[PDB]
Homo-oligomer: A and B are copies of this chain.
Amino acid sequence: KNARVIELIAAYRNRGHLMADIDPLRLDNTRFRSTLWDLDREFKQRKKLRDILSVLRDAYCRHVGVEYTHILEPEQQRWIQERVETKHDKPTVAEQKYILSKLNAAEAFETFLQTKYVGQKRFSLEGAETVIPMMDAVIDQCAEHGLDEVVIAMPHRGRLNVLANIVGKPYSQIFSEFDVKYHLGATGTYIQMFGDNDIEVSLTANPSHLEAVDPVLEGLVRAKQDLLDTGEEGSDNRFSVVPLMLHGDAAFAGQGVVAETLNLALLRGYRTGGTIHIVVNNQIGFTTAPTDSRSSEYCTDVAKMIGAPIFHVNGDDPEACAWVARLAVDFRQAFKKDVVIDMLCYRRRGHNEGDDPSMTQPYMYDVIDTKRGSRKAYTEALIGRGDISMKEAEDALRDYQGQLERVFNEVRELEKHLATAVDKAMLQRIGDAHLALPEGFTVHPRVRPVLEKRREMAYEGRIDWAFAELLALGSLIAEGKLVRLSGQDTQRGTFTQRHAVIVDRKTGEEFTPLQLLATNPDGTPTGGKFLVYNSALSEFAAVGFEYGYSVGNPDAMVLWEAQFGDFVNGAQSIIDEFISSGEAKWGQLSDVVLLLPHGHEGQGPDHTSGRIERFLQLWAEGSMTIAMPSTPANYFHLLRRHGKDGIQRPLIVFTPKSMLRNKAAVSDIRDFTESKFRSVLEEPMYTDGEGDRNKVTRLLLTSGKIYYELAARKAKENREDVAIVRIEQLAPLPRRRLAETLDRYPNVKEKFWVQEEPANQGAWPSFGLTLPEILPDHFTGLKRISRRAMSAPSSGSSKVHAVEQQEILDTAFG
């Protein structure tokens, strides 16, 4: 008998959520449909079976379905158990009237939006208004914990309602010259109704691509947390900036970026101390039923991936919705982990203007047609329970009518009316930092020569690409800049070239040489910091996060590195929807850097190209900077210009692979100490040597590592009749610098654009069309030397690659 009780308690805790009254439509009729003497007997604390069962039914089988026994941490399971398995105190009349007022403001907003304007049906929150008192309870509970800010990400459903009743934006600002408003960012201040605290509330900008903003929100919050010295990279572990992420039920289950973003939740380089997720689960996705949208019982089942607690709540019970919201914030504060709230509701109207939803879902919409909304239901529930009188119920209808009148009246009144060069001592300091090892630290025998070579390069020259990058980042940290660098195996570097973090051979303790530059020689801090991480095996969420991080902190130097540029197409939605276009669409600025290893080396179509042609196609004046530097010093100056120009614009860099170790691809100390970024580069024989520009009859225009191969052939045959000019900055085209350079070669009879990439790829599709237009006196008659047009970035054979590479060089000097 005692064993049956223990099995019954476990059954309610594990599967009680399957029997809970969570659906306000009660569509599934089989949900509930599919000894007595022992009830008065006491069982081991000592309690009667009737009391054990009543607590279990109220906690797990009422309007809240709790999923938590999947959580591997026993202390988290106990925390939930203790707060859910108790006789809860009824809310005060003032708290109930406050919830009803939020519902009044929410429904008053929806009734206005549909009546006043045309084409607003797709943004309707009708049937889901209970999300407003729920979000209000989340933010109020965050203010109760004394937190600094709540940052919201959401799709467009009920967005202007969120702006008005959550962010607190006035109607004059919302409906000012009223489309793009459903995708813009916003900021406001939330003031507690019954408390004495206030909290900042912001909304991030987003495209129509559902869930794509999810990792952008995480990076944005993480950037704000690092600035406030809270969380993982802060003195306190309060994570005082809270991500509040809203979702639709079909999008939460079908979009892969959801799983990728959940996967970042506890990572040292990406954690935000837990996200509060709210799914507006209207049990439909346009015309699609949940059975065609997901292969699981709940739309939130993906969140079990990180052992997050899940709360399924009845959208027609705003008291349960507000209580679950406050419990979610308390769980997040206690364990610094994600909490998911599944709000079961409905979509009152069609998906859009041309939709009669009974065409595709007749059963659901015959049931929806009998529904009266949460505001009217909750008013009737408070009357029946005896919580409010008829006068209080009438004053609530008067509150609703007044909120409806105020928005119509306020909208009516609105309708009536810099050097990048550093000193030699700076290079030497960064060099010395690589040998300034902590006491008792054991360097790996293969890492030690890299550290010694860096000190050698800093004092004697012949600086390679990898060190030049760290010289740029190190000098920025010394000047007080925050530098965040991440990507797949980025601490060591894919080509074993970076060693930004070195690992103790005996203890595994990490040492970051560039972090020593965050302290001045006098011992005071510079204000700078180096945050370098190995990313998860993700492109979409990682690129999204880094973009979001640069929005959250515009003063930060943010760099994301692809393993190979070929894998950045996994993040195409972030590149297309945020990086390349965010400024023009929403006035949202980003200084994010994308490092894309690129080059034809015979390693196949997925280890050759970062697709230069695609980034050049996306580019428009002032949207991005696109570069492919050929020297370590020019890359150093490119990174320093980017971090110090005071302009928030993304930078796309096509970085080297074998050229990292090319002995000809090295720079002198003077290139770092007495120079600047050069958008156009000439051969050193004309600028520093004894070369004669007047002997040149053939001009080769190129970019990247193929320069060294072209220069080697020129030197081998003593070809004084041929000159090689490098275009370092691909976008914006350096028109003036290119014109001035070409004017120094007056006897040129033919010009050729030389590239490794196929004819339909690289810089030729854009340069071949733009150069004869922007500079007709210089590029009329410009011809192409490249690989043949291909459906892939390269051949799969290293043998075919070698033949094609030699064919390019022979054509250029033929």
Contact = CB atoms under 8 A, between A and B. Distances in A.
A293 B620 contact: no
Contact of A538 (B254, B541, B766, B789): B254
Contacts of A96: none
Interface stretch (A54-62, A79-87, A359-367, A674-682): A359-367
B253 A209 contact: no
A580 interface: yes
A168 interface: no
Given A492-B359, A569-B572, A256 B621 contact: no
Interface stretch (A350-358, A424-432, A721-729): A350-358
A255 interface: yes
B584 A790 contact: yes
A503 to B, nearest CB: 6
Most buried by B among A2, A18, A567: A567
A200 B260 CA distance: 35
Given A180-B604, A294-B263, A765-B769, A791 B580 contact: yes
A286 B614 CA distance: 28
Contacts of A257: 256
Given A15-B72, A256-B258, A581-B605, A796 B537 contact: no
Contacts of A242: none
Contacts of A289: 534
A488 interface: yes
Interface in A456-500: 488-489, 491-492, 494-496
A435 interface: no
Contacts of A15: 72
Q: How large is the interface on A (under 10, 10 to 19, 20 to 34, 35 or more residues)?
A: 35 or more
Interface stretch (A136-144, A297-305, A313-321, A325-333): A297-305
Contacts of A179: 603-604, 796-798
Interface in A266-312: 266-269, 271, 285-289, 291-297, 301-302, 304-307
B604 A208 contact: yes
Given A581-B792, A769-B769, A797-B180, A209 B570 contact: yes
A147 interface: no
Given A362-B444, A446-B359, A765-B617, A256 B251 contact: no
A573 interface: yes
Q: Which of A292, A356, A504 has the most CB of B within 10 A?
A: A292
A296 B302 contact: no
Interface stretch (A3-11, A548-556, A589-597, A748-756): A3-11
A18 to B, nearest CB: 7
Contacts of A585: 605, 792, 796
Contact of A295 (B264, B494, B768): B264
B791 A362 contact: no
A447 interface: yes
Contacts of A651: none
A268 B292 contact: yes
A197 interface: no
Given A359-B446, A798-B179, A253 B567 contact: no
A430 to B, nearest CB: 21
Interface of A: 2-3, 6-7, 10, 14-15, 18, 44, 69-70, 72, 179-180, 183, 207-210, 250-251, 253-260, 262-269, 271, 285-289, 291-297, 301-302, 304-307, 354-356, 358-363, 444, 446-447, 488-489, 491-492, 494-496, 503-506, 508, 533-538, 540-541, 563, 566-567, 569-570, 572-573, 576-577, 580-581, 583-585, 603-607, 613-614, 617-621, 623-624, 758, 760-761, 765-766, 768-769, 789-792, 796-798
26 contacts: A18-B72, A179-B797, A183-B796, A207-B605, A209-B567, A253-B536, A256-B258, A256-B259, A258-B259, A267-B295, A285-B537, A286-B563, A287-B534, A301-B305, A305-B305, A358-B444, A362-B444, A362-B505, A577-B606, A584-B791, A585-B605, A613-B617, A614-B617, A617-B617, A618-B760, A620-B758
